[PDB]
Design an enzyme around this catalytic site. Structure first.
Site, PDB file in Angstrom:
ATOM      1  N   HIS B  41      -0.226   0.690   4.315  1.00 58.58           N
ATOM      2  CA  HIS B  41      -0.609   1.533   5.483  1.00 58.58           C
ATOM      3  C   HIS B  41       0.641   2.216   6.058  1.00 58.58           C
ATOM      4  O   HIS B  41       0.497   3.015   6.990  1.00 58.58           O
ATOM      5  CB  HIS B  41      -1.428   0.737   6.522  1.00 58.58           C
ATOM      6  CG  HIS B  41      -0.659  -0.284   7.292  1.00 58.58           C
ATOM      7  ND1 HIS B  41      -0.893  -1.639   7.146  1.00 58.58           N
ATOM      8  CD2 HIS B  41       0.355  -0.165   8.182  1.00 58.58           C
ATOM      9  CE1 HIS B  41      -0.062  -2.309   7.926  1.00 58.58           C
ATOM     10  NE2 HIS B  41       0.716  -1.428   8.572  1.00 58.58           N
ATOM     11  N   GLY B 143       5.397  -2.466  14.839  1.00 62.25           N
ATOM     12  CA  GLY B 143       6.622  -2.515  14.010  1.00 62.25           C
ATOM     13  C   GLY B 143       6.775  -3.796  13.187  1.00 62.25           C
ATOM     14  O   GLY B 143       7.588  -3.773  12.242  1.00 62.25           O
ATOM     15  N   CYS B 145       4.852  -5.332  11.062  1.00 65.10           N
ATOM     16  CA  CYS B 145       4.143  -5.342   9.755  1.00 65.10           C
ATOM     17  C   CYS B 145       5.150  -5.306   8.601  1.00 65.10           C
ATOM     18  O   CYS B 145       6.226  -4.680   8.737  1.00 65.10           O
ATOM     19  CB  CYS B 145       3.123  -4.215   9.719  1.00 65.10           C
ATOM     20  SG  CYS B 145       1.717  -4.550  10.733  1.00 65.10           S
TER      21      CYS B 145
HETATM   22  C1  LIG Z   1       1.601  -3.168  11.929  1.00 64.19           C
HETATM   23  C2  LIG Z   1       2.881  -2.768  12.608  1.00 64.19           C
HETATM   24  C3  LIG Z   1       3.758  -1.872  11.785  1.00 64.19           C
HETATM   25  O1  LIG Z   1       4.904  -2.125  11.512  1.00 64.19           O
HETATM   26  O2  LIG Z   1       3.119  -0.773  11.377  1.00 64.19           O
HETATM   27  C4  LIG Z   1       3.278   0.427  12.182  1.00 64.19           C
HETATM   28  C5  LIG Z   1       4.556   1.086  11.837  1.00 64.19           C
HETATM   29  C6  LIG Z   1       0.533  -3.552  12.952  1.00 64.19           C
HETATM   30  C7  LIG Z   1       0.662  -4.976  13.511  1.00 64.19           C
HETATM   31  C8  LIG Z   1      -0.107  -5.131  14.824  1.00 64.19           C
HETATM   32  C9  LIG Z   1       0.351  -4.292  16.014  1.00 64.19           C
HETATM   33  C10 LIG Z   1      -0.075  -5.112  17.228  1.00 64.19           C
HETATM   34  N1  LIG Z   1      -0.072  -6.476  16.708  1.00 64.19           N
HETATM   35  C11 LIG Z   1      -0.102  -6.539  15.383  1.00 64.19           C
HETATM   36  O3  LIG Z   1      -0.134  -7.576  14.712  1.00 64.19           O
HETATM   37  N2  LIG Z   1      -0.796  -3.339  12.378  1.00 64.19           N
HETATM   38  C12 LIG Z   1      -1.593  -2.346  12.776  1.00 64.19           C
HETATM   39  O4  LIG Z   1      -1.355  -1.680  13.785  1.00 64.19           O
HETATM   40  C13 LIG Z   1      -2.831  -2.054  11.934  1.00 64.19           C
HETATM   41  C14 LIG Z   1      -2.451  -1.073  10.827  1.00 64.19           C
HETATM   42  C15 LIG Z   1      -3.221  -1.283   9.589  1.00 64.19           C
HETATM   43  C16 LIG Z   1      -3.815  -1.216   8.547  1.00 64.19           C
HETATM   44  N3  LIG Z   1      -3.927  -1.620  12.827  1.00 64.19           N
HETATM   45  C17 LIG Z   1      -4.253  -0.296  12.935  1.00 64.19           C
HETATM   46  C18 LIG Z   1      -5.206   0.122  13.782  1.00 64.19           C
HETATM   47  C19 LIG Z   1      -5.865  -0.799  14.585  1.00 64.19           C
HETATM   48  C20 LIG Z   1      -5.532  -2.146  14.508  1.00 64.19           C
HETATM   49  N4  LIG Z   1      -6.156  -3.100  15.340  1.00 64.19           N
HETATM   50  C21 LIG Z   1      -7.447  -3.521  15.386  1.00 64.19           C
HETATM   51  O5  LIG Z   1      -8.285  -3.279  14.517  1.00 64.19           O
HETATM   52  C22 LIG Z   1      -7.768  -4.352  16.575  1.00 64.19           C
HETATM   53  C23 LIG Z   1      -8.991  -4.447  17.256  1.00 64.19           C
HETATM   54  C24 LIG Z   1      -8.792  -5.320  18.266  1.00 64.19           C
HETATM   55  C25 LIG Z   1      -9.631  -5.874  19.356  1.00 64.19           C
HETATM   56  O6  LIG Z   1      -7.517  -5.753  18.218  1.00 64.19           O
HETATM   57  N5  LIG Z   1      -6.869  -5.121  17.143  1.00 64.19           N
HETATM   58  C26 LIG Z   1      -4.528  -2.596  13.648  1.00 64.19           C
HETATM   59  O7  LIG Z   1      -4.154  -3.759  13.543  1.00 64.19           O
END
Ligand SMILES: *[C@H](CC(=O)OCC)[C@H](C[C@@H]1CCNC1=O)NC(=O)[C@H](CC#C)n1cccc(NC(=O)c2cc(C)on2)c1=O
Ligand SMILES: *[C@H](CC(=O)OCC)[C@H](C[C@@H]1CCNC1=O)NC(=O)[C@H](CC#C)n1cccc(NC(=O)c2cc(C)on2)c1=O
EC number: 3.4.19.12
Lengths: 305, 305
Positions: B41, B143, B145
């Site tokens: 992603h 960040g 991930c």
């Molecule tokens: C990845 C962070 C990273 O380094 O990538 C961006 C540069 C993050 C980790 C998350 C951020 C907050 N806490 C974490 O553990 N992952 C995401 O942001 C993922 C991406 C993928 C695939 N993502 C994207 C969009 C939405 C969500 N969240 C949900 O679906 C959700 C719903 C509810 C309620 O809570 N979360 C998501 O994790």
């Protein structure tokens, strides 16, 4: 999101851990530049431990009585010295993996990461508070001594703790890296009482802020209170007094959640006087006091090393 | 003595953490030999995340669209590949600090250490269980991930987890290092159900053994029980069923404390049906299920790396 008990990355400290042997006794040393730091009881037999004369025992020792191993490599000791309860062994080789480091003496309630070691080999890493009574609730078997506690500042390792002994209730006592015990403890096998431990109030408020930041809000109330009012209650429950310094330290968290420090103090009051009444906060069934306000911000804003 | 939540030393993993940038999106990579592993992603904008076609998005990318920083140094990507939900970036340089490693897929109830990272820089290290429903209760900001979970086997790092997302209730989901999600989760921004979580029974018994080993014995009874009797109670409290395999795994601890597994099962029964009556076990006010029987022995007998 979510909130964990988090230790600093141990990498920088792993490359300073060595094995020190003197006759029978083998424990852990900290190799920084051309100096190896270990507890001075390395020179004791378990008989000597009842009442050692460290001056006398050390006089009897020469450099070749001190074996220092850094992994498979052997270090030539070219001098030895006793500073309070630590031993400083001078060695021919400066540690190529020496990081930027300070030695600091932490205050009660300050937290640090322990790298637990046996035969100079890293075993595991966990987070600790210096308790009000200058004990730590660590995890240490025999051989663990010379294991150190540290904080990291980007690239700079601040060493605050070297482990020396277990006490009654199997709590732990140790020194700064200058060899001065935290609390009234001595490196001798005698009856030593730690005396009453108190809850680190500023840390519990930091933790409630961590909770609110993570959506744990059931304990928020309408009440406020005076610093004075609050402390009168805290004393009763063996909580350390909250100072203006503590309130000023909790400011950024105050500001990030929009909950006045004395508003949260009012929340804590309710929880002490009414109890948590079966329920949990960040999945804990008691009030947690081993996160500093800096720990909560580090984790909740994600500072990197 | 004493019992703490202990992570493995993070050193070997710190020298494999790099920063991966693709347009806007920057997250963490694992550099082993001449390959960098990250969540796929990284190639998504927050618009794409609602319903990405990863095949199509990747087709649109070339090597120079992928920036890899290892500290101050830049790594030339010379190939890119998608294995399930991880991206494999081939690079000109093999990682000089690559340790002995395996990739393993852990089972529910198995624990591992997380090295939480932001911009390819280690932030903190903590211990986790793979929950029965294949979530983890981690601490992850934006960040984070590409942060990985691992166990160490003397010198060999076994990588079991790469972090991809947060779910409802801010629990966490991720992949093995072959890019297969643990649980029914997809790398897409939708509403996703973890479904019912259960308590890891074999882990709670391991923890009670840790307690007895550390002088916490108030909860011991004379009673025994059948595996079948015990499970009929456990099911009621959303405890995972205890199997003969679990009983056999608890043997060494059985032997070290001289308390038959089914004797301790009888103790756990009491605690579930009567509750802890406001007392504590290793300073916890609830029953802890994130220590494996191997974790308890590692710590209580002090195995080294
Ligand atoms: C990845 C962070 C990273 O380094 O990538 C961006 C540069 C993050 C980790 C998350 C951020 C907050 N806490 C974490 O553990 N992952 C995401 O942001 C993922 C991406 C993928 C695939 N993502 C994207 C969009 C939405 C969500 N969240 C949900 O679906 C959700 C719903 C509810 C309620 O809570 N979360 C998501 O994790
Ligand atoms: C040092 C281990 C080491 O490497 O040094 C010898 C090779 C240990 C650390 C202990 C062992 C068990 N858990 C720990 O935290 N420290 C000691 O063993 C010290 C040494 C000194 C000085 N020491 C020696 C003798 C007795 C005791 N403790 C007690 O007398 C005691 C009393 C009560 C109650 O509990 N312990 C001690 O710590």
């Amino acid at each position: 999101s979510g909130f964990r008990k988090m230790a600093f990355p141990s990498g920088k400290v792993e490359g300073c851990m060595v094995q020190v042997t003197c006759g029978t006794t083998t424990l852990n040393g900290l190799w920084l530049d051309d100096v190896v730091y270990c507890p001075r009881h390395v020179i004791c037999t378990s008989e000597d431990m009842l009442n050692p004369n460290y001056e006398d025992l050390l006089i009897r020792k020469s450099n070749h009585n001190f074996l220092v191993q850094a992994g498979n490599v052997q270090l030539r000791v070219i001098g030895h010295s006793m500073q309070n309860c630590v031993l400083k062994l001078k060695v021919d080789t400066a540690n190529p993996k020496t990081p930027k480091y300070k030695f600091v003496r932490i205050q009660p309630g300050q937290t640090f990461s322990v790298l637990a070691c046996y035969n100079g080999s890293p075993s595991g890493v966990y987070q600790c508070a210096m308790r009000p009574n200058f004990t730590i609730k660590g995890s240490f078997l025999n051989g663990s001594c010379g294991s150190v506690g540290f904080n990291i500042d980007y690239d700079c390792v601040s060493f605050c703790y070297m482990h020396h002994m277990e006490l009654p209730t199997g709590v732990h006592a140790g020194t700064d890296l200058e060899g001065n015990f935290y609390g009234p403890f001595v490196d001798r096998q005698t009856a030593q009482a730690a005396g009453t431990d108190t809850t680190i109030t500023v840390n519990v408020l930091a933790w409630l802020y961590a909770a609110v930041i993570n959506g744990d809000r059931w304990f928020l109330n309408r009440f406020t209170t005076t610093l004075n009012d609050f402390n009168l209650v805290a004393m009763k429950y063996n909580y350390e007094p909250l100072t203006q310094d503590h309130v000023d330290i909790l400011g950024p968290l105050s500001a990030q959640t929009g909950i006045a420090v004395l508003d949260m103090c009012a929340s804590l009051k309710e929880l002490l006087q009414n109890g948590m009444n079966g329920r949990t906060i960040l999945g804990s069934a008691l009030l947690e006091d081993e996160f500093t306000p800096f720990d909560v911000v580090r984790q909740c804003s994600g500072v990197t090393f």
